[PDB]
Amino acid sequence: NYLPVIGITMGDAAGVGAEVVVKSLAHASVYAQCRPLVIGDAKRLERANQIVGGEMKIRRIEDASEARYEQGTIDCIDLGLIPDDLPFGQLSAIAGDAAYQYIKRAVELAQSGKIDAICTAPLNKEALHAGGHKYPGHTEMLAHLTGVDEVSMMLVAPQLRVIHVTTHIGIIDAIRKIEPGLVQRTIERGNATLVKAGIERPRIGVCGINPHAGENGLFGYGEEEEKIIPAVTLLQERGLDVTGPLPADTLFFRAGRGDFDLVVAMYHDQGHGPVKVLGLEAGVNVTVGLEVIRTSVDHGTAFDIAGKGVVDEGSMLEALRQGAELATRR
Amino acid sequence: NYLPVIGITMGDAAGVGAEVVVKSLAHASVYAQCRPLVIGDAKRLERANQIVGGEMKIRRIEDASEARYEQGTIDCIDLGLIPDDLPFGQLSAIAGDAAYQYIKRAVELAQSGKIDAICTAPLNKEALHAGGHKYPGHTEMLAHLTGVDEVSMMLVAPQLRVIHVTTHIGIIDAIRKIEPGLVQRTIERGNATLVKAGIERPRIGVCGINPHAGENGLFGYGEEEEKIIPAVTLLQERGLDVTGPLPADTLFFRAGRGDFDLVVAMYHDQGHGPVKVLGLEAGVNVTVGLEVIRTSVDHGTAFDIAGKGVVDEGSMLEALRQGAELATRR
Ligand SMILES: [Ca+2]
Ligand SMILES: [Ca+2]
Ligand SMILES: [Mg+2]
Ligand SMILES: [Mg+2]
Ligand SMILES: [Zn+2]
Ligand SMILES: [Zn+2]
């Protein structure tokens, strides 16, 4: 029905972002899923088109309303920041600043409702810093500019959406970090994102910390009752459809069967293993809790191959697809 | 190829074991996979056959060599322990002892090389104790009679075999329990069982404790280096094909692709979630470290339905199939 507008940020101009965007938008499949709007540098996209041997024309626009989404011609909100001769594959404070400016513009468009999702091409933290934007990372920058303190990481597969209470932390520290506030906010973020994506009443299942969710006290130190159950109870009383804590393995079986719209995993491997085992296109991370859904790829600026036309666009295509499926419905 | 002999133990005569055994062996598919030998009570199997409306005849035999494996006629190593009138659905000291005696006989047969796998029908712990056999459970009794201090639990799916260093224990205590001796033995058990099943040099992948296996010390308290790596190195030096610790999720991806014959999971949910998400026939547990592979079903003696002919044999069929696949090759 509605084809969502996806704001695609070009990332660091010295890295593979421009090339991967231009290769991605040569696929007709993209235009079955979304209306792809590039925020970036029009000249850099033209250079990338030459580098990849593409047939893409670039249309310089100022406002999202000017975009036509005609295959063969990329609509680029052109900030004009990148010198024509900026080298590929080397650190650039100018490219770092421009990567920030593309992200800032994306956040602005998301706030005004002019895009329905963000898909971020890679940037380089060192260049970002040199360019005057000393953020801890790409995701942290999006969150700060959006005005939110926390986001959650989600993985998506067929029948499976898995949002994480904790991710990149040691397992012992993970268990310490989980408590009802963070669990509650993780569930809320997942619920809100699925409502935006057109599921009016998301069916949410929540994993235990212990196997079998503790088996009525048989396993563990009461982590379910201390850390999880108070959040679940509060959100049930608010009217959300939340079940758990459940044995994580049983919940994944049921989710795969179609019983749940969302699985809330407590820690990294609990949620990541069941998605990764399926062997699907790797490298896409979903960020939950900004004004619109955001996706990205995990491959980096790849300076060793930047400007050589060899970067593979498969991960980006999947990031766009996942972004389109979770985009805000209008 | 060789059809392995599976020693099927009848379990507790008051429970659903006899019924599920008689229902299972009515399936022609079993006979394409194995030669099914029942250790139990011939009169009880006859009574079960009447109950389930079957057409099975029972042949009383003394020695495994007598078994004919003719469809329609179950070869039963008949210990003659169960009175004809023993009620279904009630605890019995005689039934509890007989369940122990069937297991004991299966262990003897495995030791002499007269069966290639064991598949156990359910028994009842309270009845076992009532018959003078004070074991913590079914699996513990098998281990004790076999002469081993430890076994490991394994789950099997297409392209995935996942053996666990720890299972039913809280997550904090699991990480404490893991140390290099236990890791080493888990890997050894897994390797030996796959060699028995005809994989000369098993390719083994080992999971980390921390996500990303610690990411070079970024996550966690050095658990990989303390608890896992000394075991992996020792076994590599001894000539086993062992890779890890690896990020668990990456390892599951690779295993699903065919890169490993065995995945060594550190704790319950790490290994169980990726198997269960696949949504395949549930209920089957594989015990590794006895003289031959052993499988079993989760469902218990089910005294509430014992003797009524309603017990479903799906789980037991899958337990037989998995047992046949992992049976000792001759
Ligand atoms: Ca975290
Ligand atoms: Ca254990
Ligand atoms: Mg190509
Ligand atoms: Mg039937
Ligand atoms: Zn990760
Ligand atoms: Zn379990």
Side-chain angles (χ1 to χ4, degrees), chain A residues 2-49 51-54 56-67 69-158 160-280 282-330, chain B residues 2-42 44-46 48-49 51-54 56-67 69-133 135-158 160-199 201-280 282-330:
Chain A
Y2 179 65
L3 298 169
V5 176
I6 303 189
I8 306 169
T9 57
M10 203 188 74
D12 185 301
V16 295
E19 290 159 84
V20 94
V21 166
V22 169
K23 291 196 175 187
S24 291
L25 303 195
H27 295 256
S29 53
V30 176
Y31 290 80
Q33 303 161 2
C34 75
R35 289 176 286 149
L37 175 66
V38 181
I39 303 151
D41 194 86
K43 177 60 174 187
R44 198 64 157 186
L45 295 170
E46 294 173 338
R47 288 292 305 120
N49 181 71
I51 286 159
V52 310
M56 300 299 308
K57 276 33 167 157
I58 310 298
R59 181 208 313 282
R60 291 153 181 70
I61 57 171
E62 293 176 3
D63 197 272
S65 62
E66 295 186 67
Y69 310 109
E70 288 164 5
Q71 289 187 58
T73 298
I74 296 177
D75 304 283
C76 180
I77 294 171
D78 179 26
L79 299 192
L81 299 171
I82 306 300
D84 297 349
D85 60 357
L86 185 77
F88 289 93
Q90 308 172 14
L91 286 162
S92 169
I94 293 162
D97 169 74
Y100 163 92
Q101 301 295 341
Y102 310 147
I103 289 286
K104 176 171 173 194
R105 184 62 63 85
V107 168
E108 289 168 353
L109 293 161
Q111 175 124 291
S112 61
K114 293 182 182 335
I115 62 179
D116 306 320
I118 295 167
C119 182
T120 57
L123 56 68
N124 177 297
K125 183 185 178 163
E126 189 176 351
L128 183 67
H129 284 219
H133 311 290
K134 300 244 201 310
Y135 289 99
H138 200 169
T139 303
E140 292 92 334
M141 178 168 59
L142 282 153
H144 179 77
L145 291 166
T146 299
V148 295
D149 282 340
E150 267 176 17
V151 295
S152 296
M153 187 262 188
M154 194 166 53
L155 292 172
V156 175
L160 192 60
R161 301 186 190 90
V162 187
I163 196 174
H164 297 80
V165 178
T166 70
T167 58
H168 295 117
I169 187 171
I171 189 62
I172 296 305
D173 290 328
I175 302 321
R176 289 171 184 167
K177 181 174 182 174
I178 300 162
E179 50 74 42
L182 181 61
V183 170
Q184 175 187 339
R185 291 190 301 274
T186 305
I187 298 164
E188 287 169 343
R189 279 186 286 275
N191 190 76
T193 217
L194 297 178
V195 166
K196 284 189 167 147
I199 302 184
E200 294 186 274
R201 304 179 181 71
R203 303 163 298 152
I204 303 172
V206 179
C207 295
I209 278 163
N210 297 292
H212 300 203
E215 183 82 21
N216 297 115
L218 202 66
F219 310 137
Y221 293 106
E223 289 93 341
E224 283 70 26
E225 298 65 34
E226 176 183 323
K227 298 174 173 287
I228 306 172
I229 290 169
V232 173
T233 297
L234 184 67
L235 295 174
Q236 289 170 335
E237 294 303 298
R238 184 182 295 170
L240 299 202
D241 181 2
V242 189
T243 302
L246 294 170
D249 59 335
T250 305
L251 178 51
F252 282 105
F253 179 97
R254 291 188 59 192
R257 278 274 189 87
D259 284 352
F260 294 94
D261 301 303
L262 181 63
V263 173
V264 185
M266 287 291 140
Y267 57 87
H268 187 277
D269 287 351
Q270 193 183 55
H272 278 51
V275 173
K276 261 71 180 285
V277 74
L278 302 169
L280 304 177
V284 177
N285 296 303
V286 184
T287 300
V288 182
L290 304 171
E291 181 69 16
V292 294
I293 201 74
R294 174 264 185 147
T295 64
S296 196
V297 300
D298 71 3
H299 62 63
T301 42
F303 284 168
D304 60 329
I305 57 159
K308 295 183 181 296
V310 298
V311 63
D312 190 83
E313 75 275 23
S315 285
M316 196 55 178
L317 286 173
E318 181 67 10
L320 291 169
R321 195 190 70 77
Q322 292 185 20
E325 291 189 319
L326 290 160
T328 299
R329 299 301 194 264
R330 311 287 181 186
Chain B
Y2 175 72
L3 297 168
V5 171
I6 306 185
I8 303 171
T9 55
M10 205 186 71
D12 186 300
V16 295
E19 287 161 88
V20 81
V21 169
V22 172
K23 286 201 182 179
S24 295
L25 301 194
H27 293 253
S29 58
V30 175
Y31 289 80
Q33 296 158 13
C34 73
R35 286 177 289 147
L37 177 63
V38 181
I39 306 157
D41 193 83
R44 203 62 161 189
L45 297 174
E46 294 171 338
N49 177 74
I51 285 163
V52 308
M56 288 296 184
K57 305 316 186 197
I58 311 299
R59 185 205 316 282
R60 288 150 180 74
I61 58 166
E62 287 172 17
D63 191 280
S65 65
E66 296 177 59
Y69 309 109
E70 290 165 2
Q71 290 188 59
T73 298
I74 295 169
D75 305 283
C76 180
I77 297 172
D78 175 29
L79 304 193
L81 300 175
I82 307 299
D84 304 358
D85 64 347
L86 182 87
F88 288 93
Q90 303 179 21
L91 288 168
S92 162
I94 291 183
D97 170 72
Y100 167 94
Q101 298 299 336
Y102 311 146
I103 287 291
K104 178 180 175 178
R105 179 63 59 88
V107 166
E108 291 170 354
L109 291 168
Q111 175 93 292
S112 56
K114 297 184 186 171
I115 60 180
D116 305 321
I118 296 172
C119 180
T120 56
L123 57 71
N124 176 301
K125 179 182 181 170
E126 181 166 5
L128 209 52
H129 286 221
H133 307 294
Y135 289 101
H138 200 168
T139 303
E140 292 91 335
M141 171 175 68
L142 278 155
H144 183 245
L145 292 169
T146 299
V148 297
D149 293 341
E150 294 182 345
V151 295
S152 303
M153 186 255 261
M154 182 164 75
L155 291 177
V156 174
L160 289 187
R161 301 188 190 87
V162 190
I163 192 171
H164 297 77
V165 179
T166 68
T167 56
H168 293 116
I169 184 171
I171 185 62
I172 299 302
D173 293 327
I175 303 317
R176 295 178 178 161
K177 179 171 180 173
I178 298 167
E179 53 76 38
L182 179 61
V183 170
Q184 182 186 330
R185 293 186 300 275
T186 304
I187 302 167
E188 291 165 337
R189 280 189 280 276
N191 189 75
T193 225
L194 293 180
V195 168
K196 290 175 176 166
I199 307 182
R201 301 174 182 77
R203 301 166 299 147
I204 304 174
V206 179
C207 295
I209 277 165
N210 293 297
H212 300 199
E215 201 112 277
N216 294 123
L218 193 61
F219 311 135
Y221 293 101
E223 292 88 345
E224 284 70 23
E225 288 71 31
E226 179 181 307
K227 300 169 175 286
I228 300 167
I229 290 164
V232 169
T233 293
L234 181 68
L235 291 176
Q236 289 170 337
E237 287 161 348
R238 292 185 179 172
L240 284 63
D241 180 3
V242 187
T243 298
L246 295 177
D249 57 334
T250 300
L251 173 52
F252 279 110
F253 178 97
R254 293 185 60 188
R257 281 271 186 92
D259 285 348
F260 297 97
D261 303 299
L262 184 61
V263 174
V264 181
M266 290 289 139
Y267 57 87
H268 187 281
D269 287 353
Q270 190 184 55
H272 276 49
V275 176
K276 270 47 175 325
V277 73
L278 303 173
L280 302 175
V284 181
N285 294 313
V286 182
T287 301
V288 182
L290 309 174
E291 183 67 19
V292 296
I293 200 76
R294 173 261 184 151
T295 61
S296 191
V297 179
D298 264 355
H299 60 63
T301 48
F303 281 178
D304 63 319
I305 56 160
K308 296 186 177 297
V310 297
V311 61
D312 189 82
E313 73 279 17
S315 282
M316 187 65 162
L317 292 170
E318 182 63 12
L320 291 165
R321 187 188 74 75
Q322 288 186 20
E325 286 186 319
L326 287 163
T328 298
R329 296 305 189 265
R330 307 292 182 183

